[PDB]
Amino acid sequence: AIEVKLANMEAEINTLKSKLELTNKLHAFSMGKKSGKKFFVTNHERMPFSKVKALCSELRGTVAIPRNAEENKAIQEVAKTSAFLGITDEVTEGQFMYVTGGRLTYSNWKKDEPNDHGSGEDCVTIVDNGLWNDISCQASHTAVCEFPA
Protein backbone atom coordinates (compact mmCIF):
# COMPACT_ATOMS: atom_id res chain seq x y z
CA ALA A 1 0.00 0.00 0.00
CA ILE A 2 2.68 2.51 1.03
CA GLU A 3 4.63 2.09 -2.21
CA VAL A 4 1.36 2.50 -4.09
CA LYS A 5 0.28 5.62 -2.19
CA LEU A 6 3.69 7.15 -2.81
CA ALA A 7 3.56 6.40 -6.56
CA ASN A 8 0.09 7.91 -6.81
CA MET A 9 1.25 11.04 -4.98
CA GLU A 10 4.26 11.32 -7.29
CA ALA A 11 1.77 11.29 -10.20
CA GLU A 12 -0.27 14.06 -8.55
CA ILE A 13 2.87 16.16 -8.07
CA ASN A 14 3.89 15.86 -11.77
CA THR A 15 0.38 16.91 -12.83
CA LEU A 16 0.43 19.87 -10.44
CA LYS A 17 3.88 20.89 -11.78
CA SER A 18 2.51 20.87 -15.35
CA LYS A 19 -0.56 22.81 -14.26
CA LEU A 20 1.61 25.54 -12.69
CA GLU A 21 3.74 25.78 -15.83
CA LEU A 22 0.47 26.21 -17.77
CA THR A 23 -0.48 29.02 -15.37
CA ASN A 24 2.84 30.76 -16.05
CA LYS A 25 2.37 30.40 -19.83
CA LEU A 26 -1.19 31.68 -19.80
CA HIS A 27 -0.12 34.61 -17.65
CA ALA A 28 2.76 35.59 -19.97
CA PHE A 29 0.46 35.30 -23.00
CA SER A 30 -2.20 37.46 -21.32
CA MET A 31 0.45 40.09 -20.58
CA GLY A 32 1.66 40.28 -24.18
CA LYS A 33 4.51 37.78 -24.44
CA LYS A 34 5.03 37.06 -28.14
CA SER A 35 6.04 33.65 -29.51
CA GLY A 36 9.82 33.17 -29.46
CA LYS A 37 10.34 36.53 -27.76
CA LYS A 38 11.37 37.51 -24.24
CA PHE A 39 8.61 38.59 -21.88
CA PHE A 40 8.91 42.26 -20.76
CA VAL A 41 6.80 43.47 -17.82
CA THR A 42 6.49 46.44 -15.43
CA ASN A 43 4.49 47.50 -12.36
CA HIS A 44 5.02 51.13 -13.44
CA GLU A 45 6.94 51.88 -10.25
CA ARG A 46 9.95 54.23 -10.41
CA MET A 47 12.94 53.45 -8.22
CA PRO A 48 16.76 53.58 -8.12
CA PHE A 49 18.66 51.05 -10.26
CA SER A 50 19.79 48.92 -7.30
CA LYS A 51 16.16 48.37 -6.37
CA VAL A 52 15.17 47.44 -9.91
CA LYS A 53 17.91 44.79 -9.95
CA ALA A 54 16.79 43.37 -6.61
CA LEU A 55 13.15 43.37 -7.66
CA CYS A 56 13.60 41.62 -11.03
CA SER A 57 16.06 39.21 -9.41
CA GLU A 58 13.46 38.35 -6.75
CA LEU A 59 11.08 37.39 -9.56
CA ARG A 60 13.78 35.26 -11.17
CA GLY A 61 14.04 37.71 -14.03
CA THR A 62 16.54 40.46 -14.87
CA VAL A 63 16.44 44.18 -15.68
CA ALA A 64 15.22 44.58 -19.27
CA ILE A 65 17.87 44.62 -22.00
CA PRO A 66 17.25 45.53 -25.67
CA ARG A 67 19.42 43.20 -27.81
CA ASN A 68 18.14 44.74 -31.05
CA ALA A 69 15.78 47.38 -32.45
CA GLU A 70 12.78 45.06 -32.15
CA GLU A 71 13.34 44.39 -28.44
CA ASN A 72 14.06 48.09 -27.88
CA LYS A 73 10.61 48.90 -29.24
CA ALA A 74 8.99 46.10 -27.21
CA ILE A 75 10.51 47.57 -24.03
CA GLN A 76 9.50 51.09 -25.07
CA GLU A 77 5.82 50.17 -25.37
CA VAL A 78 5.76 48.32 -22.03
CA ALA A 79 7.41 51.11 -20.04
CA LYS A 80 5.57 54.11 -21.50
CA THR A 81 7.95 56.33 -19.49
CA SER A 82 11.70 56.53 -18.79
CA ALA A 83 13.00 53.16 -17.58
CA PHE A 84 16.32 51.64 -16.56
CA LEU A 85 17.94 49.11 -18.86
CA GLY A 86 20.22 46.31 -17.60
CA ILE A 87 23.33 48.14 -18.80
CA THR A 88 26.03 50.13 -16.93
CA ASP A 89 29.58 51.36 -17.53
CA GLU A 90 30.49 50.97 -13.86
CA VAL A 91 33.73 49.05 -14.59
CA THR A 92 35.41 51.11 -17.31
CA GLU A 93 33.93 54.50 -18.17
CA GLY A 94 32.50 54.48 -21.67
CA GLN A 95 32.47 50.70 -21.74
CA PHE A 96 28.85 49.67 -21.29
CA MET A 97 28.21 46.10 -20.22
CA TYR A 98 25.04 44.07 -19.67
CA VAL A 99 24.32 43.39 -16.01
CA THR A 100 24.16 39.72 -17.03
CA GLY A 101 27.58 39.89 -18.67
CA GLY A 102 29.13 40.88 -21.98
CA ARG A 103 29.90 44.00 -23.97
CA LEU A 104 27.11 46.16 -25.25
CA THR A 105 26.27 45.15 -28.80
CA TYR A 106 23.15 47.09 -29.88
CA SER A 107 22.69 50.69 -28.69
CA ASN A 108 20.31 53.56 -29.39
CA TRP A 109 21.90 56.62 -27.81
CA LYS A 110 20.28 60.03 -27.95
CA LYS A 111 22.31 62.82 -29.59
CA ASP A 112 25.12 64.00 -27.32
CA GLU A 113 24.80 60.89 -25.14
CA PRO A 114 26.31 59.22 -23.24
CA ASN A 115 27.84 62.27 -21.52
CA ASP A 116 28.54 60.85 -18.05
CA HIS A 117 27.19 64.26 -17.00
CA GLY A 118 27.90 66.06 -13.73
CA SER A 119 29.28 63.93 -10.92
CA GLY A 120 28.88 60.94 -13.23
CA GLU A 121 26.29 58.75 -14.95
CA ASP A 122 26.85 55.00 -15.17
CA CYS A 123 23.30 53.72 -15.66
CA VAL A 124 21.10 53.79 -18.75
CA THR A 125 17.46 54.71 -19.35
CA ILE A 126 15.31 54.22 -22.43
CA VAL A 127 13.29 57.42 -22.88
CA ASP A 128 11.29 59.29 -25.51
CA ASN A 129 10.99 57.56 -28.87
CA GLY A 130 13.03 54.67 -27.48
CA LEU A 131 16.33 56.56 -27.44
CA TRP A 132 18.84 56.12 -24.61
CA ASN A 133 20.40 58.48 -22.07
CA ASP A 134 22.99 57.64 -19.44
CA ILE A 135 21.93 58.77 -15.99
CA SER A 136 22.80 58.44 -12.32
CA CYS A 137 22.13 54.95 -10.98
CA GLN A 138 20.72 56.64 -7.86
CA ALA A 139 17.97 58.36 -9.83
CA SER A 140 14.45 56.83 -9.86
CA HIS A 141 13.13 55.38 -13.10
CA THR A 142 10.58 52.76 -14.11
CA ALA A 143 11.27 49.12 -13.26
CA VAL A 144 10.99 46.82 -16.27
CA CYS A 145 11.94 43.16 -15.96
CA GLU A 146 12.54 40.63 -18.70
CA PHE A 147 11.98 36.89 -18.67
CA PRO A 148 13.33 34.43 -21.32
CA ALA A 149 11.67 33.62 -24.64
Place this chain on the structure above:
Amino acid sequence: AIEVKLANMEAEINTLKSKLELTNKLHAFSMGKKSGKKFFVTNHERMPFSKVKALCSELRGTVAIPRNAEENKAIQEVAKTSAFLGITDEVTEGQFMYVTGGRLTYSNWKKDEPNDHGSGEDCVTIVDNGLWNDISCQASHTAVCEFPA
Protein backbone atom coordinates in the same frame (compact mmCIF):
# COMPACT_ATOMS: atom_id res chain seq x y z
CA ALA B 1 14.13 2.81 -1.31
CA ILE B 2 10.94 4.11 0.30
CA GLU B 3 12.62 6.80 2.42
CA VAL B 4 14.63 8.12 -0.51
CA LYS B 5 11.46 8.57 -2.56
CA LEU B 6 9.79 10.30 0.40
CA ALA B 7 12.63 12.78 0.77
CA ASN B 8 12.49 13.53 -2.95
CA MET B 9 8.75 14.13 -2.68
CA GLU B 10 9.39 16.60 0.14
CA ALA B 11 11.91 18.44 -2.08
CA GLU B 12 9.47 18.37 -5.01
CA ILE B 13 6.72 19.84 -2.82
CA ASN B 14 8.96 22.60 -1.36
CA THR B 15 10.19 23.47 -4.86
CA LEU B 16 6.56 23.79 -5.99
CA LYS B 17 5.64 25.95 -2.97
CA SER B 18 8.53 28.27 -3.88
CA LYS B 19 7.57 28.39 -7.56
CA LEU B 20 3.89 29.11 -6.84
CA GLU B 21 4.96 31.95 -4.54
CA LEU B 22 7.13 33.32 -7.39
CA THR B 23 4.21 33.02 -9.80
CA ASN B 24 1.98 34.96 -7.36
CA LYS B 25 4.62 37.70 -6.97
CA LEU B 26 5.07 38.04 -10.74
CA HIS B 27 1.32 38.26 -11.28
CA ALA B 28 0.97 40.95 -8.60
CA PHE B 29 3.88 42.86 -10.19
CA SER B 30 2.27 42.53 -13.64
CA MET B 31 -0.98 43.86 -12.24
CA GLY B 32 0.69 46.99 -10.86
CA LYS B 33 1.51 46.12 -7.26
CA LYS B 34 3.99 48.67 -5.95
CA SER B 35 6.66 47.65 -3.43
CA GLY B 36 5.27 47.67 0.10
CA LYS B 37 1.81 48.67 -1.16
CA LYS B 38 -1.37 46.62 -1.29
CA PHE B 39 -2.68 46.14 -4.80
CA PHE B 40 -6.01 46.56 -6.53
CA VAL B 41 -7.59 44.49 -9.29
CA THR B 42 -10.93 44.47 -11.11
CA ASN B 43 -12.56 42.41 -13.85
CA HIS B 44 -14.68 45.48 -14.64
CA GLU B 45 -17.89 43.61 -13.82
CA ARG B 46 -20.71 45.52 -12.07
CA MET B 47 -22.67 43.74 -9.33
CA PRO B 48 -24.43 44.25 -5.96
CA PHE B 49 -22.19 44.80 -2.93
CA SER B 50 -22.83 41.34 -1.42
CA LYS B 51 -21.52 39.72 -4.63
CA VAL B 52 -18.40 41.89 -4.67
CA LYS B 53 -17.68 40.93 -1.04
CA ALA B 54 -18.18 37.25 -1.82
CA LEU B 55 -15.97 37.38 -4.91
CA CYS B 56 -13.09 39.23 -3.27
CA SER B 57 -13.32 37.04 -0.15
CA GLU B 58 -13.10 33.90 -2.28
CA LEU B 59 -9.85 35.30 -3.73
CA ARG B 60 -8.52 35.90 -0.22
CA GLY B 61 -8.84 39.65 -0.62
CA THR B 62 -11.49 42.18 0.37
CA VAL B 63 -13.50 44.90 -1.34
CA ALA B 64 -11.02 47.73 -1.95
CA ILE B 65 -10.55 50.22 0.91
CA PRO B 66 -8.83 53.60 0.40
CA ARG B 67 -6.84 54.36 3.60
CA ASN B 68 -5.43 57.62 2.20
CA ALA B 69 -5.36 59.83 -0.91
CA GLU B 70 -2.71 57.79 -2.74
CA GLU B 71 -4.68 54.58 -2.36
CA ASN B 72 -7.85 56.44 -3.30
CA LYS B 73 -6.23 57.55 -6.54
CA ALA B 74 -4.91 54.03 -7.21
CA ILE B 75 -8.41 52.57 -6.81
CA GLN B 76 -9.92 55.25 -9.04
CA GLU B 77 -7.39 54.45 -11.80
CA VAL B 78 -8.05 50.72 -11.54
CA ALA B 79 -11.84 51.12 -11.45
CA LYS B 80 -12.35 53.65 -14.27
CA THR B 81 -16.02 53.90 -13.17
CA SER B 82 -18.14 53.83 -9.99
CA ALA B 83 -17.03 51.02 -7.69
CA PHE B 84 -17.99 49.80 -4.21
CA LEU B 85 -15.53 50.32 -1.38
CA GLY B 86 -15.20 48.03 1.63
CA ILE B 87 -16.97 50.58 3.82
CA THR B 88 -20.58 50.49 5.09
CA ASP B 89 -22.80 51.71 7.93
CA GLU B 90 -24.96 48.58 7.86
CA VAL B 91 -24.29 47.70 11.48
CA THR B 92 -25.20 51.07 12.99
CA GLU B 93 -26.77 53.79 10.82
CA GLY B 94 -24.46 56.78 10.58
CA GLN B 95 -21.27 55.02 11.71
CA PHE B 96 -19.26 53.81 8.74
CA MET B 97 -16.95 50.87 9.40
CA TYR B 98 -14.44 48.99 7.27
CA VAL B 99 -15.80 45.60 6.18
CA THR B 100 -12.74 44.13 7.91
CA GLY B 101 -13.41 46.02 11.15
CA GLY B 102 -12.85 49.44 12.69
CA ARG B 103 -14.36 52.92 12.37
CA LEU B 104 -13.82 54.93 9.21
CA THR B 105 -11.00 57.45 9.51
CA TYR B 106 -9.74 58.86 6.22
CA SER B 107 -12.69 59.75 3.98
CA ASN B 108 -13.26 61.49 0.65
CA TRP B 109 -16.98 62.30 0.60
CA LYS B 110 -18.51 64.46 -2.12
CA LYS B 111 -20.12 67.61 -0.73
CA ASP B 112 -23.39 66.81 1.07
CA GLU B 113 -22.57 63.08 1.34
CA PRO B 114 -23.17 60.72 3.05
CA ASN B 115 -26.92 61.33 3.28
CA ASP B 116 -28.55 57.88 3.65
CA HIS B 117 -30.92 59.09 0.95
CA GLY B 118 -34.55 57.99 0.84
CA SER B 119 -35.26 54.53 2.21
CA GLY B 120 -31.53 54.37 2.93
CA GLU B 121 -27.97 53.96 1.68
CA ASP B 122 -25.53 51.84 3.67
CA CYS B 123 -22.77 51.17 1.13
CA VAL B 124 -20.17 53.44 -0.48
CA THR B 125 -18.94 53.92 -4.03
CA ILE B 126 -15.93 55.83 -5.28
CA VAL B 127 -17.18 57.89 -8.25
CA ASP B 128 -16.15 60.93 -10.33
CA ASN B 129 -12.92 62.64 -9.36
CA GLY B 130 -12.54 59.81 -6.91
CA LEU B 131 -15.00 61.38 -4.46
CA TRP B 132 -17.35 59.11 -2.48
CA ASN B 133 -21.11 58.75 -2.18
CA ASP B 134 -23.18 56.48 0.06
CA ILE B 135 -25.47 54.32 -2.04
CA SER B 136 -27.76 51.33 -1.81
CA CYS B 137 -25.89 48.06 -1.29
CA GLN B 138 -28.37 46.56 -3.78
CA ALA B 139 -27.20 48.74 -6.64
CA SER B 140 -24.67 47.27 -9.08
CA HIS B 141 -21.26 48.91 -9.23
CA THR B 142 -17.80 47.76 -10.30
CA ALA B 143 -16.09 44.99 -8.33
CA VAL B 144 -12.62 46.05 -7.20
CA CYS B 145 -10.63 43.89 -4.77
CA GLU B 146 -7.58 44.74 -2.70
CA PHE B 147 -4.82 42.37 -1.61
CA PRO B 148 -2.21 42.94 1.19
CA ALA B 149 1.00 44.91 0.81
Place this chain on the structure above:
Amino acid sequence: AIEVKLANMEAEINTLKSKLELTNKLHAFSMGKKSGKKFFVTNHERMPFSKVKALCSELRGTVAIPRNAEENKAIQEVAKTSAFLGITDEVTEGQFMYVTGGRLTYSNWKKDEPNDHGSGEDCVTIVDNGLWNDISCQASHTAVCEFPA
Protein backbone atom coordinates in the same frame (compact mmCIF):
# COMPACT_ATOMS: atom_id res chain seq x y z
CA ALA C 1 7.47 8.47 10.72
CA ILE C 2 6.97 7.08 7.20
CA GLU C 3 3.16 6.80 7.29
CA VAL C 4 2.73 10.10 9.15
CA LYS C 5 4.99 11.89 6.66
CA LEU C 6 3.07 10.28 3.81
CA ALA C 7 -0.30 11.43 5.18
CA ASN C 8 1.10 14.89 5.73
CA MET C 9 2.31 15.12 2.15
CA GLU C 10 -1.12 14.22 0.86
CA ALA C 11 -2.49 17.22 2.78
CA GLU C 12 0.42 19.37 1.51
CA ILE C 13 -0.50 18.35 -2.03
CA ASN C 14 -4.21 19.10 -1.59
CA THR C 15 -3.36 22.47 -0.05
CA LEU C 16 -1.21 23.29 -3.10
CA LYS C 17 -4.00 22.23 -5.44
CA SER C 18 -6.41 24.60 -3.65
CA LYS C 19 -3.87 27.40 -3.79
CA LEU C 20 -3.19 26.93 -7.51
CA GLU C 21 -6.91 26.93 -8.25
CA LEU C 22 -7.17 30.23 -6.37
CA THR C 23 -4.23 31.64 -8.31
CA ASN C 24 -6.03 30.66 -11.54
CA LYS C 25 -9.26 32.34 -10.38
CA LEU C 26 -7.40 35.51 -9.47
CA HIS C 27 -5.60 35.56 -12.82
CA ALA C 28 -8.86 35.10 -14.76
CA PHE C 29 -10.52 37.87 -12.71
CA SER C 30 -7.62 40.20 -13.48
CA MET C 31 -7.83 39.12 -17.15
CA GLY C 32 -11.42 40.41 -17.22
CA LYS C 33 -13.36 37.16 -16.92
CA LYS C 34 -16.98 37.91 -16.00
CA SER C 35 -19.00 35.63 -13.70
CA GLY C 36 -20.57 32.76 -15.64
CA LYS C 37 -19.09 33.99 -18.92
CA LYS C 38 -16.39 32.33 -21.00
CA PHE C 39 -13.35 34.54 -21.37
CA PHE C 40 -11.19 35.51 -24.30
CA VAL C 41 -7.52 36.47 -24.11
CA THR C 42 -4.85 37.64 -26.55
CA ASN C 43 -1.15 38.55 -26.53
CA HIS C 44 -1.94 40.78 -29.54
CA GLU C 45 0.33 38.75 -31.79
CA ARG C 46 -0.67 38.06 -35.40
CA MET C 47 0.15 34.65 -36.89
CA PRO C 48 -1.11 31.92 -39.31
CA PHE C 49 -4.12 29.85 -38.21
CA SER C 50 -2.14 26.66 -37.54
CA LYS C 51 0.02 28.54 -35.03
CA VAL C 52 -2.99 30.04 -33.28
CA LYS C 53 -4.45 26.58 -32.82
CA ALA C 54 -1.18 25.15 -31.54
CA LEU C 55 -0.81 28.07 -29.16
CA CYS C 56 -4.33 27.94 -27.65
CA SER C 57 -4.13 24.13 -27.43
CA GLU C 58 -0.91 24.44 -25.46
CA LEU C 59 -2.67 26.82 -23.04
CA ARG C 60 -5.50 24.28 -22.81
CA GLY C 61 -7.95 26.60 -24.51
CA THR C 62 -9.36 26.78 -28.04
CA VAL C 63 -9.35 29.35 -30.86
CA ALA C 64 -12.07 31.87 -30.06
CA ILE C 65 -15.57 31.01 -31.25
CA PRO C 66 -18.58 33.34 -30.90
CA ARG C 67 -21.83 31.35 -30.39
CA ASN C 68 -24.13 34.37 -30.33
CA ALA C 69 -24.04 38.12 -30.81
CA GLU C 70 -22.78 38.80 -27.27
CA GLU C 71 -19.73 36.55 -27.51
CA ASN C 72 -19.05 37.94 -30.98
CA LYS C 73 -18.83 41.46 -29.59
CA ALA C 74 -16.67 40.27 -26.70
CA ILE C 75 -14.13 38.74 -29.09
CA GLN C 76 -14.18 41.91 -31.20
CA GLU C 77 -13.35 43.99 -28.11
CA VAL C 78 -10.48 41.74 -27.00
CA ALA C 79 -8.81 41.53 -30.42
CA LYS C 80 -9.06 45.19 -31.48
CA THR C 81 -7.87 44.08 -34.94
CA SER C 82 -8.68 41.20 -37.31
CA ALA C 83 -8.60 37.84 -35.50
CA PHE C 84 -8.94 34.20 -36.46
CA LEU C 85 -12.03 32.37 -35.23
CA GLY C 86 -12.13 28.63 -34.53
CA ILE C 87 -14.13 28.00 -37.69
CA THR C 88 -12.91 26.62 -41.07
CA ASP C 89 -14.19 24.77 -44.12
CA GLU C 90 -10.89 22.89 -44.50
CA VAL C 91 -12.57 19.48 -44.50
CA THR C 92 -15.26 20.11 -47.11
CA GLU C 93 -15.10 23.30 -49.18
CA GLY C 94 -18.13 25.47 -48.54
CA GLN C 95 -19.04 23.74 -45.28
CA PHE C 96 -17.77 25.70 -42.29
CA MET C 97 -17.34 23.77 -39.06
CA TYR C 98 -16.17 24.63 -35.55
CA VAL C 99 -12.64 23.40 -34.85
CA THR C 100 -14.16 21.81 -31.74
CA GLY C 101 -16.67 20.07 -34.01
CA GLY C 102 -20.01 20.55 -35.74
CA ARG C 103 -21.85 22.89 -38.10
CA LEU C 104 -22.44 26.59 -37.32
CA THR C 105 -25.37 27.55 -35.08
CA TYR C 106 -24.52 31.23 -35.47
CA SER C 107 -22.72 33.40 -38.01
CA ASN C 108 -22.17 37.06 -38.82
CA TRP C 109 -20.83 36.98 -42.35
CA LYS C 110 -20.06 40.22 -44.15
CA LYS C 111 -22.08 40.58 -47.38
CA ASP C 112 -21.09 38.01 -50.04
CA GLU C 113 -18.84 36.11 -47.65
CA PRO C 114 -17.63 33.40 -47.36
CA ASN C 115 -16.44 33.28 -50.98
CA ASP C 116 -13.20 31.21 -51.00
CA HIS C 117 -11.65 34.09 -52.96
CA GLY C 118 -8.81 33.66 -55.41
CA SER C 119 -6.36 30.91 -54.53
CA GLY C 120 -8.63 29.84 -51.67
CA GLU C 121 -9.91 30.80 -48.22
CA ASP C 122 -10.66 28.16 -45.58
CA CYS C 123 -10.30 30.17 -42.38
CA VAL C 124 -12.39 32.89 -40.81
CA THR C 125 -11.53 36.26 -39.30
CA ILE C 126 -13.74 38.59 -37.29
CA VAL C 127 -12.95 42.10 -38.57
CA ASP C 128 -13.11 45.64 -37.13
CA ASN C 129 -16.91 45.59 -37.49
CA GLY C 130 -17.66 42.30 -35.81
CA LEU C 131 -18.53 40.96 -39.26
CA TRP C 132 -16.80 37.86 -40.63
CA ASN C 133 -14.77 37.18 -43.76
CA ASP C 134 -13.22 33.93 -44.88
CA ILE C 135 -9.51 34.38 -45.54
CA SER C 136 -6.35 32.32 -46.15
CA CYS C 137 -5.38 30.13 -43.18
CA GLN C 138 -1.79 31.04 -44.08
CA ALA C 139 -2.31 34.77 -43.55
CA SER C 140 -1.37 36.20 -40.15
CA HIS C 141 -4.10 37.51 -37.88
CA THR C 142 -4.46 38.16 -34.15
CA ALA C 143 -4.40 35.12 -31.86
CA VAL C 144 -7.38 35.03 -29.51
CA CYS C 145 -7.90 32.03 -27.23
CA GLU C 146 -11.06 30.99 -25.42
CA PHE C 147 -11.46 29.42 -21.99
CA PRO C 148 -14.72 28.03 -20.43
CA ALA C 149 -17.27 30.00 -18.39
